[PDB]
Symmetry: C3
Amino acid sequence: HNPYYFHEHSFQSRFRSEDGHWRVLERFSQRSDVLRGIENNRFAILEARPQTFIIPHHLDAETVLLVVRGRAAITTVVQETKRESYNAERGDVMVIPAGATIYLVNHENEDLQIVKLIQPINNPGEFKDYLSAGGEDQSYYTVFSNDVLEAALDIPRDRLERVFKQGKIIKGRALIKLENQTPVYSNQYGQMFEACPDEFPQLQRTNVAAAIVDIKQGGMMVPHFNSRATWAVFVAEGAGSFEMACPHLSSRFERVAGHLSPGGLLVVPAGHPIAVMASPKENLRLVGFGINAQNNLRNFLAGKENIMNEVDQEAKELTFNIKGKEADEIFKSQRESFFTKGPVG
Amino acid sequence: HNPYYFHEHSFQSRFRSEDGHWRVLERFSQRSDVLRGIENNRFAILEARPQTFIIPHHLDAETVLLVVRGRAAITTVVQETKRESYNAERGDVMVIPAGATIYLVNHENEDLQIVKLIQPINNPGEFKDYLSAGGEDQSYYTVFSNDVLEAALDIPRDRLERVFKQGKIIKGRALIKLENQTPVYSNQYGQMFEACPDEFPQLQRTNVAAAIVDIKQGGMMVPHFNSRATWAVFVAEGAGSFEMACPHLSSRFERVAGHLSPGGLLVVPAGHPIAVMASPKENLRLVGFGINAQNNLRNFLAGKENIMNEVDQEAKELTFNIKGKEADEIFKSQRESFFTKGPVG
Amino acid sequence: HNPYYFHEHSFQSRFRSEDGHWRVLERFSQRSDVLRGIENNRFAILEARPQTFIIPHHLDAETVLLVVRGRAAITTVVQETKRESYNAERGDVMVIPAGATIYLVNHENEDLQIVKLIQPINNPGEFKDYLSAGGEDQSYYTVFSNDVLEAALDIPRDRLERVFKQGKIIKGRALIKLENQTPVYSNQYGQMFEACPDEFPQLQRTNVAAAIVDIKQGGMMVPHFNSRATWAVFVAEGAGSFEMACPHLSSRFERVAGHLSPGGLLVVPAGHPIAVMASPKENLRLVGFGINAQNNLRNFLAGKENIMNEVDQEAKELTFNIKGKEADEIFKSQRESFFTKGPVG
Ligand SMILES: [Cu+2]
Ligand SMILES: [Cu+2]
Ligand SMILES: [Cu+2]
């Protein structure tokens, strides 16, 4: 009865090794139908234990990187050929071209969490991992004929047999630091940082936008919706809950309700009205990428600055049960904007 | 034997209330196959009796508005938040973003017809209607928990129970006035007004172009076709008929023939040669939107200015049965261009 | 066991007449699945014997023309109406809009080969041919009512019965000359000419890029891959062979191997590592169009200038079995770049 929320476990696992876990959430078209326009997107995550390394690789796919926890040092290379390497702490955003080869090192004493947004460039809603070391079958040097390897590298074939044979995580104007930006919505009850294509050319490729939201203890992000963007948001830390009105689940809306437990992913389509509560005990951080966000507007149904306030009184009078001015009693009554103090029970 | 034409009745109805009728034509992939590249488009219409109001709402979808009959006053709002309201008479074009909330009033003593072109932003070829009042299930305030409503609006929950509870049509650089523009084709036998993306940034989003065609009594729009654009055209007023050559219905063309009765919709794919007759009795107005029109050329097979005239004689000589000059006897013989006097019988 | 390669015969034939052969390769979704993101593309070819003519026509589809063998004179017209005609020798590239009408003449004493890349504008991965002469069913004048023809052209209907009745190949800032451009990769062992969207606005439409590759006798194009572009490449002249590592054929790579015999087509998806050998006896020319190439990078796994060289030593040390410097022994050892001397046996 609730399609839009995926659990920790619903992640299709990729690796599961001591040094790290790299796993991708299944596409949006197994399970549901109502998610289609985002199907060429895949949400994935990465974990790498302290003192870890990740092999040089690439994807036939576009990646949007957002680091959740810890720290790592990133490197991207392409081809005349150029090198770019960066410092990644919590709340960093990177836009990694398809075919662009990248490695990384987690040199740090606690874990490293990284959330990727991957758009397959080849087969729609299907991507993969092109890798330098592993398997009898797993290297893009290792698998090739020794005659063509030996020819190509200009070195003796038995000597090749000792280097490129002898998975990905082992022991050890591109980036923009997201959390180091200016919150579009802050107040007291929570803060939201956002990087969008309209301000950031590097995003215009991947089509998407990147964000990080915090809602304080017992806070709330008021009912509202996204113009165009379809957001996929992951639960970084904490717990909470949400209500979203769904027409598909015949324009009658049924309420979609649920709790956000750590390591979950919620999908919030364009124009979907949503309100979010950050729970009695702890705070809640959501971290995640919107699909299709360009000139995407967020419109609020409550709070001081919202859409109602900007409508003529007559509209309000005919629409609801309220008067020419007495409308303002109702919609200016939330003294805060965006986030405010939420429900109980 | 004729896919491209839909009747009045083939419209999937939405409302059917005294004050108004809002209905959407089914997509193009029930029935046929040959219409695919336009499937993410949906043609819809709106009728609102005199002294009528339409609720604030939005769609997860892009809308291209063209008013057919009568008059109405339009309003759009989004979110810092801004208001835009406009005057709409016959032949007005508006481009309404997804998620952008809009209301309208028909204050006028005759009916109001409005034709919408809707592109689903969420689920391809599937859109919907996000609404403020109706149902036990039908409001995006009404359905939400009173605890989150009460929290969010900062007002007592029983007091909420008397306002947001107590369908859409009830009793009561965005727009450009299309009919007030300059006809690309006029002569005597008919006049055609067109607004295209290449001249109009607001269209570049929605990808489409907007047009209104009049063909006089017994007039004709000569055989021709659209470069790229796939046109969906509705029959505003009058009656008439058409011939269009279809290869799908194996490059052998079969003739597609039919009559345009009021309230119909014809689809004319890119490169589809078409000729149109405005009938013995009355005139014919077509009103409608082209899909995929950018730098879209219209090429004419007859009439003074047309494509043949600009080809070398040798081509014409080898191609048809005609001579080096005697080709010009054949293709300059229509003394008019575009529209001319049509057939009989 | 090898999807990516199509034979001469796998071409869906269109015409087969003495004066010419026009045939289109079937789409990429009969046979395989792994080719999807290119399905709206169709590769086609054209052959026209000496002293031949091709009718004025158009497609509901975008064409990218590359001439292989011989010579022909090209003409394009659209609509106010304009004419453009050009000289085409071996290695010429043209970008032909949908709906744009075109004819051609092979006036020359040997054959004429032309490779087209066609993107359906109407029905995805489905295009067609709009033609002036043939059939009882085959003309877009011939099929139309005489009443509407006679009306439209302003000439007597029996007189129409003697001109437009009395297939396509019969007896007889748009173009850029590709082979007359500057090779991006040359050395001795082979030369590669390329025209891309990023340098050529006319390509930005069709989305694609155009190329011609020569690999000398016993030459090789070293293992490498394309960032974004999915290349479809045809075998102009000669023979040869290739190895490409495929993950789909579960990130374990299996080697895809084969021989390129004349008149074949190979598909090389984005990020697919490939090495190519030009065979013991003759040389090898590949001719063809990349899909989705914008800012598409080609990255090399061997050869003096390649991606490894630009990575830090520590990466190389952890990755492979090699030392801080002794890495450079391995990857700078190919004294050439791009093409070099290949295997034997
Ligand atoms: Cu929904
Ligand atoms: Cu057709
Ligand atoms: Cu593959």
